[model samples]
Target chain A: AGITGTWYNQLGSTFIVTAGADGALTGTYESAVGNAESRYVLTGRYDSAPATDGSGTALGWTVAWKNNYRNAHSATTWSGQYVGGAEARINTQWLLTSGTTEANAWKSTLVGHDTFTKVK
Target chain B: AGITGTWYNQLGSTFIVTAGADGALTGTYESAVGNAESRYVLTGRYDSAPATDGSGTALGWTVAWKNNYRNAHSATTWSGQYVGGAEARINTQWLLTSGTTEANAWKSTLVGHDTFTKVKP
Candidate 1:
């Protein structure tokens, strides 16, 4: 019923989030790839309202990278479903734009799926 | 860190568990399928040790049915990896042997995926 917790994905990426006012989500993201040693600032939103997809509560977050072979060249977001039930989880599909600056559309965007499970 | 709780899958099946000794998991399951109105016995095990797949904890559970299309016709098990991290979950691949008698093997086994998330009171 709440969004404050530590979470991880299959790739061993870590997302530690804290609850903020008005459904604000603040956290840290440590990826298993590309500047693996660093933890990036994580900012996002959570809505207990039913998602547009009608499966779960709406959840989303973003992380801007500073050391991924280039300074601040990558920005990523995970559009998720905080599938609230007995198993509180966020199933997400992410989009990452990288490898170039703005004005690039086709080649610079990458999309993938990741499901996050709570730890503590 | 304890295994006693209520859990649910994407299919809306309900699993209620209680603490048992020596890693034994005792529970009741209410399914969304055949014999949907009845509550069945759920028996399973949980091992906090690393899974064979080397990702998370090892867990498994089973449910046997008495009233499907025929009498006492179905049995299923969810072989799961209790992926214990910040978000604790049981990611499972299940096998169900149904629609035939004891002698049948080929066409009776069905496999699929499921996940169980805890519901804290």
Candidate 2:
């Protein structure tokens, strides 16, 4: 009925998330690129509200991902939201923006999107 | 090496046949439509023959399809032959003629044809 699972990117990286009780969602993610591993914890809340949209709700959720793993590792935070759509299945897309890093304090940011399909 | 299974039509229907000794084939068929059912028995000998045709023999065979199951139905007899061919698998076709229905008291002629494929390869 609801979606709660790990999504893997085409690059073999993954992010895990679970829907919350009050229209909120939380998750942690880790990705390995070449010889480096990046990890983060994310928290977010649904914008359009799934309950209000009924079965075909296309609600958007905002999330903040904070880098919390790796030694001597710095923190980079980004905010993104996901829009939900339903056909015969559940589908959602997430995007990230406003990325800040402690190492590079300049006006630098990162934005990206991810999608998931509900299987169970 | 040979084919052995039942064939089903698109409309929840079927015809059953089996190949036998030295290029011979035999089978029976029954069909139901509305509230009536018809049954028949068949026997035939392969002409082009399996061994001689290798995998693609377009030889014909003689077969008799007799209305043996239903006595009231009487016997509408006919003779047809089958040929074999090969693609990725063995394929066959059959034709029949000379049907005689005793109750009809007429020429009672008949001609029909069908095709089949070998599943065993």
Candidate 3:
């Protein structure tokens, strides 16, 4: 289970991964921007199995955003890998702590790149 | 100091950082790809004064390579930022460990983006 279920990233966000039992990772992040109606709340953990050409696993998750919709006070951390063969990508590297705080938290703690597939 | 002296990246590699005292960082890296005459060794650290528009400070460096040139049994760590204004630039996000070990270390631990400026002299 390379992170179970529906995924879709590249800004047009909507990720819902829920597969619990050991490498527990629960999720639901709906960020199309601003507050596309809000559905944010996620947790993190991974590194179960994947070595059948699907590459080794390493995952991380975090999404914290709620009422501060407009201000967009945020939290993001998606560091991933699950790309080895026949189309089922999940190659990420994200680090966001955008605007409004830590006086720009070392350049606002931003750096991104997303590629999630299996859109269903 | 904003990471003193010579810089050039975008694959056309060459980085030399040296400034010791407090946030000490020593350096020298040369990789046009596979031992381009060799000159590798760097240290890491940063977070001194930088907020006058040059954004806030955050820097890191590491380069280890030798001998096994071809296989490039490598090591690279460049995490940066020095873009706040006035000419000088340094915007990086690299994490390379290509070609070996960790059983492919989460896809060979590779991700890149380089932009280092100020060449000449």
Candidate 4:
């Protein structure tokens, strides 16, 4: 529902997501880095979690992506409150990783305090 | 001590910081966006706070910067436990703003679970 469609950042980075009935999410990240660009194929799931204040349910989601243009992979995670229909204010992290197992590929370097507005 | 000198991301964005005796922090953000680069002057303070797990004191810091290339501004915040002498595992956020007052610029849309290591000479 709220996890479907295209999400864009102010820098023009785009995430095109498709949701399954079972809460599975598949998407692509097209990042615009100045004159160059990078792309990734992403897959993950969405669920509900208790809010930080423990007052109500919050939208929780995770997606893992491998860079299509480079030898890199990362996971994007979200935890936020649903502000209204098809939109939410989210706190997100981009964890960069290396190696074969997800356990060994654990380096989180970038974080964002942003909004997710579903555009379809 | 830990807030002095440079901190770099894997993507090569660099932060050069100078800390005062009173814990006031002033810094510059040199972000490398592909072939293009952007710079910003930052100012803030560092303090100690209770940890999320209520275990020990955590390093809490706040810095605000305005982009030199655009009309945008952001504030970077850190809440983390020191891993060793000059390193920390931190949860960070970049809050982008547009309005004048810090109250009006209250949108927090990004969060990070990351590590910070001090770089000095």
**Residue runs of model 2 more than 4 Å from their true location after superposition:** A32-37, A47-107, A117-120, B1-121
Cα deviation of A47, candidate 1, in Å? 45
Q: lDDT of all the models against the reference?
A: 0.56, 0.32, 0.56, 0.41
If scored against the real structure, what TM-score would every candidate get? 0.43, 0.30, 0.33, 0.36
True contacts kept of each: 0.00, 0.00, 0.00, 0.00
Candidate order by decreasing lDDT: 3, 1, 4, 2
Q: How much is the lDDT of residue A66 in candidate 3?
A: 34
Those runs of model 1 whose alpha carbons end farther than 4 Å from true positions after fitting are: A1-120, B48-55, B67-72, B99-105, B119-121
TM-score of chain B of 3: 0.31
Query: Which runs of model 3 end up more than 4 angstroms from their true locations?
Result: A1-87, A95-107, A110-115, B1-87, B97-103, B110-115
Clashes of each: 11, 1, 2, 10
Q: After superposition, how far is residue A17 of candidate 4 from its true place, in Å?
A: 0.6
DockQ per candidate: 0.01, 0.00, 0.07, 0.02
Q: Candidate 3 chain A: worst 10 consecutive residues by lDDT?
A: A65-74
Per-residue CA lDDT of model 3 for A1-120, tens digit only, reads 646877888668878888555444566777555255676555554444333443335555655443223224434555555553456777666655433223554565577678888763
Tell me which of candidates 1 and 3 scores higher on DockQ: 3
Q: Please give the distance, in angstroms, between residue B81's alpha carbon in candidate 3 and its true position after superposition.
A: 5.3
For TM-score, the strongest prediction is 1
Which whole-number lDDT from 0 to 100 does residue A66 have in model 2? 24
Greater TM-score among 3 and 4 belongs to: 4
